[PDB]
Amino acid sequence: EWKFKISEVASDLEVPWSIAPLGGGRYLVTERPGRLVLISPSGKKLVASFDVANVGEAGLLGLALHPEFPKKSWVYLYASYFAEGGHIRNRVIRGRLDGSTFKLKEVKTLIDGIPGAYIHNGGRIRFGPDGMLYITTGDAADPRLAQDLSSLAGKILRVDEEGRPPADNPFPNSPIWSYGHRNPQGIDWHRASGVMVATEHGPVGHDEVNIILKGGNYGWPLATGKAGRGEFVDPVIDTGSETWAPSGASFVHGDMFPGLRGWLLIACLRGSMLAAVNFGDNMEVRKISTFFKNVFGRLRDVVIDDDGGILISTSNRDGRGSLRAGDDKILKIVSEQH
Ligand SMILES: OC[C@H]1O[C@H](O[C@H]2O[C@H](CO)[C@@H](O)[C@H](O)[C@H]2O)[C@H](O)[C@@H](O)[C@@H]1O
Ligand SMILES: OC[C@H]1O[C@H](O[C@H]2O[C@H](CO)[C@@H](O)[C@H](O)[C@H]2O)[C@H](O)[C@@H](O)[C@@H]1O
Numbered sequence: 001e002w003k004f005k006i007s008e009v010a011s012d013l014e015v016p017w018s019i020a021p022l023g024g025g026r027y028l029v030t031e032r033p034g035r036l037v038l039i040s041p042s043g044k045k046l047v048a049s050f051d052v053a054n055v056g057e058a059g060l061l062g063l064a065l066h067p068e069f070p071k072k073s074w075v076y077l078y079a080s081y082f083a084e085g086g087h088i089r090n091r092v093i094r095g096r097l098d099g100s101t102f103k104l105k106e107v108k109t110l111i112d113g114i115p116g117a118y119i120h121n122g123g124r125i126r127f128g129p130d131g132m133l134y135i136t137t138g139d140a141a142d143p144r145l146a147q148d149l150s151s152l153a154g155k156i157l158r159v160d161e162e163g164r165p166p167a168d169n170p171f172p173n174s175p176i177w178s179y180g181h182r183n184p185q186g187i188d189w190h191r192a193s194g195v196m197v198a199t200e201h202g203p204v205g206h207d208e209v210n211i212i213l214k215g216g217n218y219g220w221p222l223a224t225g226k227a228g229r230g231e232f233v234d235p236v237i238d239t240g241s242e243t244w245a246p247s248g249a250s251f252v253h254g255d256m257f258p259g260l261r262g263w264l265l266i267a268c269l270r271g272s273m274l275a276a277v278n279f280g281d282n283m284e285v286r287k288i289s290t291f292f293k294n295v296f297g298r299l300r301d302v303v304i305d306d307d308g309g310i311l312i313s314t315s316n317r318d319g320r321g322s323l324r325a326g327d328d329k330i331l332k333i334v335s336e337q338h
């Protein structure tokens, strides 16, 4: 039996979408309505507010710190906005975080005009082992766009710290890394192999975990789940008629849980649970385990803390859940001897 203790790191957040551990019990968190907050043992501090398109699944979403933070004080955000005509689009912006008096300055847009909608905005951003920023985007309720290489919808993007496509991106002067995605909201890299993984919401069922290759076509909307065709890269997990609704995903690492090292943790929304996936040698799926089914409600992000603790966000205030007292929360999972 897995043995642990769970505390509440923060409470009454409104749809905490993304969590970036700062170290020493400090955390940066986006709330989907349009606020970047600093969580400390001391308390809760508003860093920045944004005028976002806070409608359906759109709003203030992904958050990533520069690999060189706080030395390079750059913070990246993914946010929905109302464009010309009232249409929802998505952008990646960047500011500099003031080391004292935590406030955000010199905010600029890096990437603009990603398609958006009430549904399927993607929105998870994270730096990989290569130092590049990766960005997930959904099909914006327009599935054909996922196969279309001139469209930024239904993709995983890869840009530098400035939002530029590297010369070795798979397509000509294009931020696209992979394509054929429906609504990916979870990415991480295996800490030992550097193999990249992504989660995705499927059509009702057929939620996916994919191993992401450079230039790979993940099939949507021509294929869903394990299709067995040469032209499309199949998922390593396909939930079939079952709905997990996976979002954030992190590989376990650090001191706290040595038995979980190299397992993939996945926060599930409608599934209301923490899935754990054990990968063998050559990234084969050894085991899948399921935790906290319906005890916290909807879960959105999973990140590892500086010490190796498991941080999880609840998402019962997103229009789709039933509230517990003090929702939404950031929970920390530590070892029983902690
Ligand atoms: O709306 C029906 C049309 O859909 C397809 O074309 C659209 O999709 C492509 C995007 O992947 C675009 O290249 C094209 O410009 C869009 O019109 C289909 O291929 C067409 O035959 C249909 O008329
Ligand atoms: O045969 C159906 C599968 O075809 C592809 O997978 C094969 O081709 C890859 C290299 O071209 C190999 O890495 C892989 O091991 C092969 O199985 C496709 O990627 C799969 O999704 C299809 O199921």
Ligand SMILES: [Ca+2]
Pocket (backbone or CB within 6 Å): 180, 208, 218, 219, 220, 223, 224, 225, 233, 234, 235
């Ligand atoms: Ca797929």
